[PDB]
Design a protein around this nucleic acid. Structure first.
Ligand code: MG
Ligand code: MG
Ligand code: MG
Ligand code: MG
Length: 112
RNA sequence: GGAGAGGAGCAGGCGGUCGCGGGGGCGCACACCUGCGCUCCCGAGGAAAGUCCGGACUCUGGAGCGGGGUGCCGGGUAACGCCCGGGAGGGGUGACCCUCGGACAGGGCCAUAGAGAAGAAGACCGCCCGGGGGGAAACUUCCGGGCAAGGGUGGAACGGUGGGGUAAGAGCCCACCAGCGUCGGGGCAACCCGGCGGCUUGGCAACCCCCACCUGGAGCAAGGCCAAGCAGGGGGUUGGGUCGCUCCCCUAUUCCCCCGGGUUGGCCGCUUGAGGUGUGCGGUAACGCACACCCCAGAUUGAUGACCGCCACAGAAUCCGGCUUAUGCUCCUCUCCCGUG
RNA sequence: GGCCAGGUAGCUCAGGGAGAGCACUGGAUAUGGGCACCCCCUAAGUCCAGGUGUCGGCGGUUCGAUUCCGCCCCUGGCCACCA
């Protein structure tokens, strides 16, 4: 859903500068009110996370978590998900349910 | 069965619940441009990779030189540093694998060790002859002369080993060998086979070089178009005109250089191509030709996931040909070895 | 996707027969300290002695390669339109 896909080239700077942030050991989540009746997701994966296979797997998991849990995630925010060094350190050791739990714990705390 | 060499294919599938990317069809709104909404088709790789070669395709005004690349020979190909076949040299019992022009065109470099390393250089331990001296002798000593043959030195010592011949010795002579020169035969050829002959005189060109062949340079962020927006200023014996050098066609601010500020939108390029698959024919093969069938990702923060059930390596970004590296199986050949019918 | 750089003692940097600087380990000795000397402790310093390496890895050429020729690994940077 590309209507659900927020542009990062223009908006990342604005969200970084004007928005809020939440984090845990695996993710940093940046967010800002978008003035819409729905939320939009963006993913920023640092080059150092790895090659296409690895980065694309992470992005797919993130997109899926967001899509399936859209109903419970707060509405009216532009959201940027950023994986942390730790995650890229035990990514192969971290299962899907753990990534889901850790990401949702942050997403559900987006206020207000 | 064991050990090993060459090579071909596949990339866990099939049946379920949700979620994407591009086409098509449809539902509709269309006073235009177009704007959404919901089924059929297709949707990462053998390496998509590293960017090591070769193209195609774009933009830079000409030509020459330099520079760079390839390196036995013959094909194949759009082309290549690739592929196929063949020739020499080497390794392995063997199937097989690896190597590749020229050092009497020239210049330069060979440390250390060693008597001597490029004109033929050299006498270290030595071998033999002719005298003078000492000494009973063995032996020592001095001068004159002859050896590259043994040993030592090396990565290599100016042909190799055996016999004859030498005072002692040398291709001095002869044998087989290696090299070179020729004559003759077979190959398109690289080269091979046979005969004759003095006696022959380092290595490195992944150093410059010589010979033969090929070759501008950038690169899809190439380049073309639309929309949007701010703000200009300082320079040019001229400089710049898609690497350098040399001659040459230009152009004078609108061009180029520096500082500063505006976008950090959308469309084209963007996928049908030296393209796959299936036969038939030619060719040792690589591959070519003929006919038939097919449409096989085109994203632009960048599309393939999660749950269930019987059994790796890693993700296209302009597209192809090949190389190299990363990696899980399965099958087909042939070689040697133990053991049996 | 493409195009360039660079990888040397721990760190910064030189350059076809492996070095400087900071630095570390010792010995010397207070004008520091146990008290005041004797005796002894500690070395910021100052003397001196050195300690030391797959040349980013793995092959090839060469009798020898930091230098030459291949590939692989790691670390940085550059690109688009407007005027
Ligand atoms: Mg059996
Ligand atoms: Mg690539
Ligand atoms: Mg000799
Ligand atoms: Mg440009």
């Amino acid at each position: 859903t590309r209507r659900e896909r927020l542009r990062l080239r223009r908006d990342f700077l604005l969200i970084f500068k004007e928005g809020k942030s939440l984090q845990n050991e695996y993710f940093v989540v940046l967010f800002r009110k978008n003035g819409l009746d729905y939320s939009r997701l963006g993913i920023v994966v640092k080059r150092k996370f790895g090659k296409a296979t690895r980065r694309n797997k992470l992005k797919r998991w993130v997109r899926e978590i967001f899509r399936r849990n859209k109903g419970v995630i707060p509405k009216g925010f532009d959201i940027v998900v950023i994986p942390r060094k730790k995650l890229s350190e035990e990514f192969e050791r971290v299962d899907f349910w753990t990534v889901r739990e850790k990401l949702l714990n942050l997403l559900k705390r987006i206020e207000g």
